[model samples]
Target chain A: SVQIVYKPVDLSKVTSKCGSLGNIHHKPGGGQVEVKSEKLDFKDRVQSKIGSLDNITHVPGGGNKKIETHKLTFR
Target chain B: SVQIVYKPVDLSKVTSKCGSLGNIHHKPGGGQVEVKSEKLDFKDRVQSKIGSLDNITHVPGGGNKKIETHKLTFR
Candidate 1:
């Protein structure tokens, strides 16, 4: 089986967690850098896990500070 | 052996199955929280790999929410 790896385009978008959301997504980047990101509106999207962000920065640009991490099956 | 690396910025935008665009140019950052970001319309370039995001709440200071994590190689 091949090793599954998670990568990113932006590291800032990929962090530990937040103080409000009660840990949304943690340690995303998968140690790699430089990935693409999009403005995904999360109105009715419910996930089944826990992560954290700590605080909000009001990033100069706009978009939720989250990475689009998905499950990849390697065999 | 040479290692082909891939990375992302808006981790929320990326994922393990982020191969949608068949992967876009997974950015490239320097690990600094205070870095600049750019939204490439993607007339070219590509990347490979995926990460994880398990709520994706509506941050008051909205954004697709991701960071900038770059790549480094050791020999």
Candidate 2:
């Protein structure tokens, strides 16, 4: 049987410049990233601290500031 | 050696109600969907017509109208 695995791009240790605001940081959060060949379960979605801009904030401003735009390049 | 494949969800023939605007329609466009196990090329990104809201317009309004919010459920 062919077992398929879903591997989400790692973003931990990734940091980006937030321009005037400062910088944006990323880290791994709770939840396991799963990918099984038997069945593709979209419910077992990948989770990460930097998955969305809503979880990220300006470094200098901390939680008080929200990041407007960001660019993610997967390597 | 284990080969990996990227399978994107299909959206052709899918339609949705745009509420006050009318209905939102979807169709398949050009480009080949590729997933090779040898090397994962992020550059070979999947292409689709209904991939984004920008390509979709309100049924009654056609190209003149824009979709503000849309919900996509994968089955």
Candidate 3:
């Protein structure tokens, strides 16, 4: 079957409470940050609702498409 | 109790540089995403194939469930 790529994802629209620097972007050094996402729902309710969160995300390889979660401190 | 409402999750299949894209399904915005699975072997394992992940899940308001992780560029 044929499939279309999502062009990855330009998550540049990501916003944070700490302002621009809080948005969690990439860096020259293998830096890190937290993540806040609904993707965490991948747990018991694989098909739950659209959740809003305040965890964290990490950007690797000095790029946008490279994101990961180092620590997820939630309130 | 009565139950029959797995009508939400349509993440399709998802992979990343973590491979696959990883498969993909659907996202409806004001949406949320999750592990697409159970909490796992006391952690976030799979059916039993277990895992290569000490991972978890979340879901945010957006289509694709808004996966978040701050600047996690660590070694």
Candidate 4:
């Protein structure tokens, strides 16, 4: 089987509340976001709809396509 | 059952590659991050570990805790 390649995503659409630079993006299919404050609300919002989330950890090497994984977080 | 309240999460630890401002964070339990590029890789990594994800949408009705549950996306 062929694996799906990685691609760029839109981030300008992300919006949030609390005025602390919080943003949320909801779109058909699947979506990703960048958060700094109100992480729980953002996390909860995503999890409530996304089921569970696993934080991706990559080994710093330099333009590495190999993304390692082993665990996940179920809310 | 009592619902859990939202909390803030750490983001400084998020790291990534391709130098396109991509950051990934992992710390045993679970984590989140921001990505302007390699969105597919980020989504794949998280989905691979977390299983599935659904984008969250808001109805713009103040800080009313409703969440408006109506759908889910299973990977």
- Model 4 TM-score is 0.15
DockQ per candidate, 2 decimals: 0.07, 0.02, 0.03, 0.04
**If the candidates were sorted by their lDDT against the true structure, best first, what order would they fall in?**
1, 3, 4, 2
- Chain A TM per candidate, in order of listing: 0.15, 0.16, 0.14, 0.14
In order of TM-score, best first, we have: 1, 4, 2, 3
User: Clash number for every model?
Assistant: 78, 3, 54, 3
Ranking by DockQ: 1, 4, 3, 2
- For candidate 2, the per-residue lDDT at B72 reads 25
Model 3: per-residue Cα lDDT over A1-75, one tens digit each: 323222223324432221112132222122222233442333442322223322223322221232434342222
For TM-score, the strongest prediction is 1
Candidate 1 per-residue lDDT over residues A1-75, each given as its tens digit: 333345644433232332232223333342323443454333343342212222222223222344234333322
Considering chain A alone, report the TM-score of candidate 4 relative to the true chain A: 0.14
lDDT of 2 by residue, B1-75 (tens): 433343323222212222123222233122222221332233333432211112222222111221222222222
Whose TM-score is higher: candidate 2's or candidate 4's? 4
Q: Which stretches of candidate 3 lie over 4 Å from their true place?
A: A1-51, A63-75, B1-44, B47-75
Tell me the deviation in Å of residue B69 in model 1: 1.3
Taken over the whole model, the C-alpha lDDT of each candidate is 0.31, 0.25, 0.27, 0.26
Candidate 3: true interface contacts recovered:
0.04
Full-model lDDT, candidate 4: 0.26
